PDB file of C-alpha atoms in Angstrom:
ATOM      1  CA  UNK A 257    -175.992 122.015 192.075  1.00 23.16           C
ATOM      2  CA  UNK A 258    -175.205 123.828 188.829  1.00 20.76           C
ATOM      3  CA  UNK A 259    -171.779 122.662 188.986  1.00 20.22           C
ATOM      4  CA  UNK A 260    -172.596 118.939 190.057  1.00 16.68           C
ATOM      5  CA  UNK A 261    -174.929 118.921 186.928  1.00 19.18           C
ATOM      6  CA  UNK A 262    -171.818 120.047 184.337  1.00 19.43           C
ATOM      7  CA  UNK A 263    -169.693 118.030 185.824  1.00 18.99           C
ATOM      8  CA  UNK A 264    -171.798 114.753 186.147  1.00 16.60           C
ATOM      9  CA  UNK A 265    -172.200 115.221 182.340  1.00 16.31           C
ATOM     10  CA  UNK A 266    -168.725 115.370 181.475  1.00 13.79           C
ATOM     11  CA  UNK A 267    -167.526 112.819 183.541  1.00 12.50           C
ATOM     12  CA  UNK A 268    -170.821 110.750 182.400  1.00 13.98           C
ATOM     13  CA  UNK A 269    -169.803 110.981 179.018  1.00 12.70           C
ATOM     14  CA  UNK A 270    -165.819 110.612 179.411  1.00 14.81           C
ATOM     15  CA  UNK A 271    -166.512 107.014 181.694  1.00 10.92           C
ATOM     16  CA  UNK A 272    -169.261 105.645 179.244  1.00  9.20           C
ATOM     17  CA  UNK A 273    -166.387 106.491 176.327  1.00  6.85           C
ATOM     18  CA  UNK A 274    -163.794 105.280 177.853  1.00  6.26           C
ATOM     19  CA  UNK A 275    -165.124 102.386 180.316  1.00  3.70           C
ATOM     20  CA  UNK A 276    -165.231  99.487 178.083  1.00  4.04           C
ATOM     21  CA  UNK A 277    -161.879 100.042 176.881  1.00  5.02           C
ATOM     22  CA  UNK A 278    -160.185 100.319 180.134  1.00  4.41           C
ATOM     23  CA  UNK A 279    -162.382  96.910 181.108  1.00  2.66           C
ATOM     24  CA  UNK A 280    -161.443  94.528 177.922  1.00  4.82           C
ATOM     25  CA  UNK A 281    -158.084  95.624 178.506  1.00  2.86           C
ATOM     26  CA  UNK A 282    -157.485  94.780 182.219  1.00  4.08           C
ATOM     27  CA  UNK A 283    -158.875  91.668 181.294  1.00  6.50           C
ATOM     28  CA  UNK A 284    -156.340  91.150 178.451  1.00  8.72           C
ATOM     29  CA  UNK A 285    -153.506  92.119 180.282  1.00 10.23           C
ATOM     30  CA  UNK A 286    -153.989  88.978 182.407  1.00 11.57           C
ATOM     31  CA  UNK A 287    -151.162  86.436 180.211  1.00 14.92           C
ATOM     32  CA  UNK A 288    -149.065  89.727 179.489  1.00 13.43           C
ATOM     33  CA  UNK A 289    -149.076  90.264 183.083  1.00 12.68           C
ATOM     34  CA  UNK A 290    -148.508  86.750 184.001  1.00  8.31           C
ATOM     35  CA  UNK A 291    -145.796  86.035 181.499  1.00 12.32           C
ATOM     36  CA  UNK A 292    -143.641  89.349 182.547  1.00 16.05           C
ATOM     37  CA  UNK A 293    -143.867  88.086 186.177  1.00 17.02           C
ATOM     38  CA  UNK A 294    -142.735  84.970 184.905  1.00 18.30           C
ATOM     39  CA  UNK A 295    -139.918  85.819 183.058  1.00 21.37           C
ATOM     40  CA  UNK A 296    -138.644  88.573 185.448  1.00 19.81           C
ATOM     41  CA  UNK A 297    -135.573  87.172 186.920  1.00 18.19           C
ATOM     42  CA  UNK A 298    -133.677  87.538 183.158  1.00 19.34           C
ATOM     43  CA  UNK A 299    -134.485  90.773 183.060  1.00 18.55           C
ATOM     44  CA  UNK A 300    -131.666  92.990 185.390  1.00 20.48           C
ATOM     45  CA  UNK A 301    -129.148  90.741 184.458  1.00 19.19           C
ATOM     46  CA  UNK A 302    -129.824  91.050 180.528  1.00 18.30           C
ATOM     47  CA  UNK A 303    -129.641  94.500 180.262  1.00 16.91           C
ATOM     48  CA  UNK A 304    -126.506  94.550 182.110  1.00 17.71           C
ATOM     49  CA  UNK A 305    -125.016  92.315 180.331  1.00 20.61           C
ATOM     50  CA  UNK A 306    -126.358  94.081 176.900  1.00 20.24           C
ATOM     51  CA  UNK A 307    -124.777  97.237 178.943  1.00 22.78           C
TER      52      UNK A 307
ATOM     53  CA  UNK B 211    -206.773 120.656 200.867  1.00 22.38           C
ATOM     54  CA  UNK B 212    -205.913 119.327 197.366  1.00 22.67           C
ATOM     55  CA  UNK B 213    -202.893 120.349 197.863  1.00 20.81           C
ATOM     56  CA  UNK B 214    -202.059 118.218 200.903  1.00 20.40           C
ATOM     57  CA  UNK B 215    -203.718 115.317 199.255  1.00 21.89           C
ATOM     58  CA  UNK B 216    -201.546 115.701 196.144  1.00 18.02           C
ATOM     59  CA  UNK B 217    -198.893 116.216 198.397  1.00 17.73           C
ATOM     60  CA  UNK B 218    -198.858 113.224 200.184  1.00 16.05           C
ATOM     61  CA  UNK B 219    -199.914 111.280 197.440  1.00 15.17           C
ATOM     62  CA  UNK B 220    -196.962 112.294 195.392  1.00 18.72           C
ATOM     63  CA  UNK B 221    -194.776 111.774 198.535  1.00 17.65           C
ATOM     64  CA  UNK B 222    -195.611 107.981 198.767  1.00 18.74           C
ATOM     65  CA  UNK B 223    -195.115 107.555 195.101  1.00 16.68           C
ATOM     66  CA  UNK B 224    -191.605 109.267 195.867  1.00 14.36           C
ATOM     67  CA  UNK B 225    -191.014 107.208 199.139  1.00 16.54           C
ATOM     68  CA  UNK B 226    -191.640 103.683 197.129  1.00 14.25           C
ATOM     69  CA  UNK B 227    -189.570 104.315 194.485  1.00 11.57           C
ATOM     70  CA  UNK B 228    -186.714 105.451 196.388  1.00 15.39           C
ATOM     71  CA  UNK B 229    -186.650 102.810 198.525  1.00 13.63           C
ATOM     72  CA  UNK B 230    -187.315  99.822 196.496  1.00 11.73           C
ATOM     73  CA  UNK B 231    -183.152  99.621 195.889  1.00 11.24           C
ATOM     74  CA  UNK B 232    -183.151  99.457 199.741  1.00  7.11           C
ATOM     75  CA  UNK B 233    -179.673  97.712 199.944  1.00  5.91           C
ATOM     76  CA  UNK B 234    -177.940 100.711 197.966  1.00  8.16           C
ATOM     77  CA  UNK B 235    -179.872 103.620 199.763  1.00 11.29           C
ATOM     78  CA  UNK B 236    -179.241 102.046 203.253  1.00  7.44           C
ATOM     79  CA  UNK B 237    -175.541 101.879 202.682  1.00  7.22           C
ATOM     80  CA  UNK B 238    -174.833 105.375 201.048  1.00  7.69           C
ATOM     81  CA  UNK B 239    -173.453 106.772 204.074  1.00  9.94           C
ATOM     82  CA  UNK B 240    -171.601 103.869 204.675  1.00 10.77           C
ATOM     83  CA  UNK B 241    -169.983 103.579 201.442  1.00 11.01           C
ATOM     84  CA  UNK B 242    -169.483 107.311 201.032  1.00 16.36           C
ATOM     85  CA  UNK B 243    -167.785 107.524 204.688  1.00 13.79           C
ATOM     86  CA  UNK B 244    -165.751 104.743 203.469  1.00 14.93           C
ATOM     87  CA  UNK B 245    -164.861 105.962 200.061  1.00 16.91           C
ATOM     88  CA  UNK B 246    -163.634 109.498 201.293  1.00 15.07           C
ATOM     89  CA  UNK B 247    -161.583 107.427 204.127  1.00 17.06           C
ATOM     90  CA  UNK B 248    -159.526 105.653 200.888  1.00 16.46           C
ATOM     91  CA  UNK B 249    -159.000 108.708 198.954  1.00 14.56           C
ATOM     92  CA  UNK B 250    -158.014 110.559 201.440  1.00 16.57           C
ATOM     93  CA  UNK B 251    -155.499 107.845 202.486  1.00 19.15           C
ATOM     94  CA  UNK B 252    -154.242 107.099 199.594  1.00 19.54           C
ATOM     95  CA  UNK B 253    -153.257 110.992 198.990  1.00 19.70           C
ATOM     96  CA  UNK B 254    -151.699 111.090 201.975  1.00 16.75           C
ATOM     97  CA  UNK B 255    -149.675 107.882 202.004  1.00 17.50           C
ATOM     98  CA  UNK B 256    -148.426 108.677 198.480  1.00 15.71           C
ATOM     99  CA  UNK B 257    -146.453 112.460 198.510  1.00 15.09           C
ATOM    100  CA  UNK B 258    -144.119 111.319 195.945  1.00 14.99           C
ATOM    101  CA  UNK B 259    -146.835 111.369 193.121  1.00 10.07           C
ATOM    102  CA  UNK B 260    -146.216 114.684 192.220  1.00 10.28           C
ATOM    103  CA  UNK B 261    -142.844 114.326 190.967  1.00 11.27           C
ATOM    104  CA  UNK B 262    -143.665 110.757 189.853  1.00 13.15           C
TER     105      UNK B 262
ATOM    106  CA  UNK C 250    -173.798 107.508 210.040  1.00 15.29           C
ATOM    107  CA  UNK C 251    -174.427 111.441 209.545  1.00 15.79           C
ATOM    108  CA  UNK C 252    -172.722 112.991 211.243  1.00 18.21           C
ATOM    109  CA  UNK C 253    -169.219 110.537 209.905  1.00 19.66           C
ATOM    110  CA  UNK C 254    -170.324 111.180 206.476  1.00 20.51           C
ATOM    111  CA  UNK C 255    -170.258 114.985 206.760  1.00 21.26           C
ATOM    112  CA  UNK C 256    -167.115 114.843 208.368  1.00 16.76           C
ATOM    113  CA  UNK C 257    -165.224 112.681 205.623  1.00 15.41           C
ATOM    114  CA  UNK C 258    -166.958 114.331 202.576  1.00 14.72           C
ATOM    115  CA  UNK C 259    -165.341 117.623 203.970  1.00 14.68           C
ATOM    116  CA  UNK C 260    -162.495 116.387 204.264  1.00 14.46           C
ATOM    117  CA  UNK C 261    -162.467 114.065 200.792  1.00  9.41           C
ATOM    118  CA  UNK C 262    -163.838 117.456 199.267  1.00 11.53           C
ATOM    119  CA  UNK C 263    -160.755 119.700 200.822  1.00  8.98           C
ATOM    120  CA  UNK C 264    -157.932 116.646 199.303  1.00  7.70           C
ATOM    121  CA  UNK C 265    -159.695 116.505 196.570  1.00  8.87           C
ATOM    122  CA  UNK C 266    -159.071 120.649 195.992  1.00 10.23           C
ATOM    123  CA  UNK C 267    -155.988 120.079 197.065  1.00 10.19           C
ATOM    124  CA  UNK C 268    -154.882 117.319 194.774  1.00 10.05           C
ATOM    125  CA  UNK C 269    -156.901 118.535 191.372  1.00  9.11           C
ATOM    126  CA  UNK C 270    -154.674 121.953 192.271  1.00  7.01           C
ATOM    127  CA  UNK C 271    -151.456 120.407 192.564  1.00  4.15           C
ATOM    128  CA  UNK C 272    -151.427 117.005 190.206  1.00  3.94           C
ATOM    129  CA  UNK C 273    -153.951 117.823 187.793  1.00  2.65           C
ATOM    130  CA  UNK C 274    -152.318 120.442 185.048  1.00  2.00           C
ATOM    131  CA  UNK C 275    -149.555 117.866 184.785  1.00  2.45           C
ATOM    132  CA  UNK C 276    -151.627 114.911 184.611  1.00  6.17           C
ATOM    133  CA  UNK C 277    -153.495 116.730 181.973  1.00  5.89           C
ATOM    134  CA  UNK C 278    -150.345 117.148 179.827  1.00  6.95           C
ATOM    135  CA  UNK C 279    -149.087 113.725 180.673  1.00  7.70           C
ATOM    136  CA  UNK C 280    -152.355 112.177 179.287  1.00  7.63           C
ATOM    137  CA  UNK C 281    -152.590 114.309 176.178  1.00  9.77           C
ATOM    138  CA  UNK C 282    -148.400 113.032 175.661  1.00  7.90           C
ATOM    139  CA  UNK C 283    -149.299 109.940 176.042  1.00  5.59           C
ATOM    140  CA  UNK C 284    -152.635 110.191 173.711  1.00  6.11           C
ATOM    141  CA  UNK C 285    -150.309 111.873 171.203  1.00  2.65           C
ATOM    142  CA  UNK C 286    -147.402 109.103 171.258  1.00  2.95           C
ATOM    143  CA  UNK C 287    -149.845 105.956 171.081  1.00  4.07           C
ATOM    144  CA  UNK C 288    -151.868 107.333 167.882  1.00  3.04           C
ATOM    145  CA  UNK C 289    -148.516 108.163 166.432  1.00  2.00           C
ATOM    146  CA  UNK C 290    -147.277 104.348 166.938  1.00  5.84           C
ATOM    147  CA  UNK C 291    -151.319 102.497 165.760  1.00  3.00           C
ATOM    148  CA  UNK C 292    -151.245 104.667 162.358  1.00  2.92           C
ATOM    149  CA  UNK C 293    -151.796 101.507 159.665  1.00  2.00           C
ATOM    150  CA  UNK C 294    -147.861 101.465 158.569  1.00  2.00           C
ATOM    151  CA  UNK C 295    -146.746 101.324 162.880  1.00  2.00           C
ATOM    152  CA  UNK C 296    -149.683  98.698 163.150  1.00  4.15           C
ATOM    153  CA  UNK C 297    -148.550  97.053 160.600  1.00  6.39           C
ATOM    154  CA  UNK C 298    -144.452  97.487 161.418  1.00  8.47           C
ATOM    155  CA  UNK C 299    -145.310  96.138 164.679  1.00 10.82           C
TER     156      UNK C 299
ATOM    157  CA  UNK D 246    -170.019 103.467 192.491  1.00  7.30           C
ATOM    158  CA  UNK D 247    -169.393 105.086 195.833  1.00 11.45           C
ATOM    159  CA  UNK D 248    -168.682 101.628 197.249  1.00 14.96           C
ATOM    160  CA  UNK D 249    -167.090 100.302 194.384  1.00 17.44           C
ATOM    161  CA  UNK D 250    -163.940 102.874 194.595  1.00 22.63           C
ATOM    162  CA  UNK D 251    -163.796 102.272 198.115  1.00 22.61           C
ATOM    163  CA  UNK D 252    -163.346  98.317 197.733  1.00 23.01           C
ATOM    164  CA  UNK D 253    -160.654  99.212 194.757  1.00 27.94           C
ATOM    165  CA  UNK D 254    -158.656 101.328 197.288  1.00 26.47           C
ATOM    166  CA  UNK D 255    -158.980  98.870 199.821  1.00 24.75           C
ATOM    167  CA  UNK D 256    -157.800  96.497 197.885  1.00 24.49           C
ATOM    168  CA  UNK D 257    -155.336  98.045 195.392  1.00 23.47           C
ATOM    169  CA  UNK D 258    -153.439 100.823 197.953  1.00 24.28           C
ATOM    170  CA  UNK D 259    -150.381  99.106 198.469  1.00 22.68           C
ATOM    171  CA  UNK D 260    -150.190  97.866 195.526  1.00 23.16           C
ATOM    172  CA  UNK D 261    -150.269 101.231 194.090  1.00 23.68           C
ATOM    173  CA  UNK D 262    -148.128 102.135 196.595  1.00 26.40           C
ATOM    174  CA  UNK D 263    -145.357 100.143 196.062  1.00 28.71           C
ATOM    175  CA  UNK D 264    -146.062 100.883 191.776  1.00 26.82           C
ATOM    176  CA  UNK D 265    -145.629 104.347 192.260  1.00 26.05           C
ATOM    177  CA  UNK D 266    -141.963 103.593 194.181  1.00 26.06           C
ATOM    178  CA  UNK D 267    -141.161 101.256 191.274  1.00 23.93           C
ATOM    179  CA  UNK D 268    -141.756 103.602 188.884  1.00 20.77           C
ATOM    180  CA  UNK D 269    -140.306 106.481 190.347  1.00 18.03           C
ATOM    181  CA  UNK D 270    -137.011 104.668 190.551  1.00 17.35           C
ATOM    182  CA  UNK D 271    -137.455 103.290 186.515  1.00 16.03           C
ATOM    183  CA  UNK D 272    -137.928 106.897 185.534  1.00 15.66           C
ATOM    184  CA  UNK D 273    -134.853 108.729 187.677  1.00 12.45           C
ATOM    185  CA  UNK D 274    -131.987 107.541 185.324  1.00  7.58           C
ATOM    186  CA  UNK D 275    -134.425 107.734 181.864  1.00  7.87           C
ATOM    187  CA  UNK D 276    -135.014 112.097 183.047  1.00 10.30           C
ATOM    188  CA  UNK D 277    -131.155 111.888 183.918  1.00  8.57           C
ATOM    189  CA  UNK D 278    -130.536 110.949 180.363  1.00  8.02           C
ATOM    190  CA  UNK D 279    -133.421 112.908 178.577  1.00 10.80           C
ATOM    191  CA  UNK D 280    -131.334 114.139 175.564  1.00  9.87           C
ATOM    192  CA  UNK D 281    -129.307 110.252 175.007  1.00 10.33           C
ATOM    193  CA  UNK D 282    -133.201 108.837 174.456  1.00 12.35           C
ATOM    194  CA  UNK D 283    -134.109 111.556 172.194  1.00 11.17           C
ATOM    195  CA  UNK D 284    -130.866 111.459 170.149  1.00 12.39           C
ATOM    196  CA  UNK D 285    -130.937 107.961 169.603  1.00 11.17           C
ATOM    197  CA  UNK D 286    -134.604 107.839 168.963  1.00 11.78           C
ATOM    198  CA  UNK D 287    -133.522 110.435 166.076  1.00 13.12           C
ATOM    199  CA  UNK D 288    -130.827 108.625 165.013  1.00 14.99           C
ATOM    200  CA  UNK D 289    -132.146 104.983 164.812  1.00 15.71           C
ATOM    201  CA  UNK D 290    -134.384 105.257 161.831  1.00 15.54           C
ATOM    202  CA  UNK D 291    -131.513 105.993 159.607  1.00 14.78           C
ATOM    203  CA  UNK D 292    -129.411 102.884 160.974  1.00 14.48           C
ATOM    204  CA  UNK D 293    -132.735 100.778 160.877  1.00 15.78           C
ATOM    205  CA  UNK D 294    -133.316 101.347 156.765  1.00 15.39           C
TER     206      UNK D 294
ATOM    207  CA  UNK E 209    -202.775 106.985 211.113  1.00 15.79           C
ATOM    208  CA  UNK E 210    -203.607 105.157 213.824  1.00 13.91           C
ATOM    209  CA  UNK E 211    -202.473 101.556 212.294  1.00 16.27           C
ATOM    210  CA  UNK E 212    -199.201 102.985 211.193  1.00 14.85           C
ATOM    211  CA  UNK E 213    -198.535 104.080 214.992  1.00 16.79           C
ATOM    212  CA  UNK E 214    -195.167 102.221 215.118  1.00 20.12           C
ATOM    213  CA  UNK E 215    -193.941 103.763 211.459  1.00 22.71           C
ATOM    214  CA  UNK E 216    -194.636 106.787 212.292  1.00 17.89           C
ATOM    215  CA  UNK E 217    -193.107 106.595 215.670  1.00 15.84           C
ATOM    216  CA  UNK E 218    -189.924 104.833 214.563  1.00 15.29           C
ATOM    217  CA  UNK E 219    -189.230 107.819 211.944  1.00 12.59           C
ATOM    218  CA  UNK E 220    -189.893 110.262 214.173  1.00 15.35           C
ATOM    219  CA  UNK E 221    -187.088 108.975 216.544  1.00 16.27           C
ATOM    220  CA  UNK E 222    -184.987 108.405 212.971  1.00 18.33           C
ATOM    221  CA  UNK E 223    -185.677 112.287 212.125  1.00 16.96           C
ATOM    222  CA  UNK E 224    -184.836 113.181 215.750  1.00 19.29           C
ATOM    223  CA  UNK E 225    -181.133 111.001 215.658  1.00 17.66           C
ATOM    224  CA  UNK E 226    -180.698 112.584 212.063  1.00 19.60           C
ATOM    225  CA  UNK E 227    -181.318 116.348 213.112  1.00 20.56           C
ATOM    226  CA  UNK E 228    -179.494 115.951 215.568  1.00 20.59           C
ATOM    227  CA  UNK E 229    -176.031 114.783 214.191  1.00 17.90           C
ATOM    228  CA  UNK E 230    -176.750 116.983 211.250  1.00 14.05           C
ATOM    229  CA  UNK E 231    -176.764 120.163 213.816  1.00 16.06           C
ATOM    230  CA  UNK E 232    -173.828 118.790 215.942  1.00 17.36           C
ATOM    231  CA  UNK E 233    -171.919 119.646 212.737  1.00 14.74           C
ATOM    232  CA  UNK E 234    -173.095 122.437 211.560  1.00 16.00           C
ATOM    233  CA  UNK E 235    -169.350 123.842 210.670  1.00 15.38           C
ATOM    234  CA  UNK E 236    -168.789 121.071 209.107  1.00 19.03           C
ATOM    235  CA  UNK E 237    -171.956 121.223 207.124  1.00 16.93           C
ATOM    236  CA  UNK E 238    -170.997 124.960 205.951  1.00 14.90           C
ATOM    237  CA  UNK E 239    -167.800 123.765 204.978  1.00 17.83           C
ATOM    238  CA  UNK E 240    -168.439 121.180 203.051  1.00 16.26           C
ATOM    239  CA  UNK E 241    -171.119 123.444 200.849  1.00 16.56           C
ATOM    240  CA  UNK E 242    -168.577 125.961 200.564  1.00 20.38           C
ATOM    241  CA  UNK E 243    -165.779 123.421 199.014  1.00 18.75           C
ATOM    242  CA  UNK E 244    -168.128 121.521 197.230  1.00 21.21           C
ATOM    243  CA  UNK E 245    -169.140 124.631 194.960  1.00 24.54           C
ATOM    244  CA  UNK E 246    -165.722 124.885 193.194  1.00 22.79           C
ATOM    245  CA  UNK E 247    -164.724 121.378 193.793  1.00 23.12           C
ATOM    246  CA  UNK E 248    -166.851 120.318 191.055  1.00 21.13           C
ATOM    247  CA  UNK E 249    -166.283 123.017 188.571  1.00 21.47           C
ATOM    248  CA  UNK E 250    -162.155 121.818 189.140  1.00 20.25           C
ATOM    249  CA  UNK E 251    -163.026 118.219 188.575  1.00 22.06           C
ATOM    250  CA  UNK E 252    -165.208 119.686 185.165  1.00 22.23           C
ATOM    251  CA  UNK E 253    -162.496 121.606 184.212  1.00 22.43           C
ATOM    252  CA  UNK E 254    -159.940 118.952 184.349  1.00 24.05           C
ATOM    253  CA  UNK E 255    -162.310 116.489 182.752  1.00 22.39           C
ATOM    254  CA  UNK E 256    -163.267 118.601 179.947  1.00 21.03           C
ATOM    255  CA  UNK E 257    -159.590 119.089 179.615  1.00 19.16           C
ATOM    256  CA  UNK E 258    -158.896 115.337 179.079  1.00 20.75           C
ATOM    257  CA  UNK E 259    -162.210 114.956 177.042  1.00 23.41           C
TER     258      UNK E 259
END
């Protein structure tokens, strides 16, 4: 019990830090996402080439 | 006597608010069965994450 | 429902252990690198470069 | 939250999975060549101004 | 009491299936106290490490 309440707190507080964050940017990452996917195929044969 | 009273007083005061997020409290089990299930799969399917 | 629960929190506990013992003080270092290297590249002049 | 992870896993194992292959394979050469990064990292700047 | 014959009844027979799968594993039970009272301190300690 007396370690469930220390570490409840910590991770309480670490999550409600650094929750929104990690939400607004997995929604963001969306068009990055979709435009890497997108433009994948250039990708091997660019660096090769720049190789 | 007024102990008892208290008691069970106290315990339906206890009981009612417990339960009133009935969906949640009736699944616990459920959902903590099914969460140790993942985790444990997913450490298990995964033995290159170390070096990773 | 019990007696299933029991059983998996066990073993979730046990590969949890196992997992915090073996990934964890790496993971640790890996997120303070990472920490590190990111506020080095959003200082006003990288923000600004980039 | 307890059912919450569980759907995540169930729905994002493979594809963590198959990220953690990926990756492993992206960062083989890049720990091959740990000193070519850092020594043109170092180097760079000076070419850049 | 008497109007609430079928509650009572019906958690009876709940606190009889209950106890009884609780007992059935009672190993297991032991167990998982006995991991869960450093599991949490490890999960603290790797949070607070990360804070």
């Amino acid at each position: 019990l007396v370690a469930a309440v220390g570490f409840g707190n910590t991770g309480g507080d670490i999550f409600e830090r650094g929750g929104p964050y990690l939400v607004r940017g997995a929604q963001d990452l969306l068009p990055t996402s979709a435009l890497l996917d997108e433009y994948s195929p250039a990708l091997f044969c660019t660096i090769r080439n720049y190789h | 006597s007024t102990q008892v009273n208290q008691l069970l007083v106290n315990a339906q005061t206890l009981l009612a608010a417990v339960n009133e997020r009935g969906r949640s409290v009736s699944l616990l089990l459920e959902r903590v069965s099914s969460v140790s299930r993942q985790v444990e799969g997913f450490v298990d399917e995964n033995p290159n994450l170390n070096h990773v | 429902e019990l007696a299933n629960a029991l059983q998996d929190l066990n073993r979730v506990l046990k590969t949890t252990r196992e997992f915090l013992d073996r990934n964890g003080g790496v993971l640790t270092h890996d997120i303070d690198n990472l920490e590190q290297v990111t506020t080095a590249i959003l200082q006003p002049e990288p923000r600004d470069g980039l | 939250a307890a059912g919450s992870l569980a759907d995540l896993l169930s729905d994002n194992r493979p594809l963590l999975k198959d990220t953690i292959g990926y990756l492993d394979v992206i960062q083989a050469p890049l720990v091959e060549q740990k000193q070519e990064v850092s020594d043109i990292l170092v180097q760079m700047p000076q070419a850049l101004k | 009491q008497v109007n609430s014959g079928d509650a009572i009844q019906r958690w009876a027979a709940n606190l009889n299936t209950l106890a009884a799968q609780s007992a059935q594993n009672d190993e297991a039970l032991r167990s998982g106290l006995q991991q869960a009272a450093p599991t949490a301190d490890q999960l603290n300690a790797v949070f607070s490490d990360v804070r």
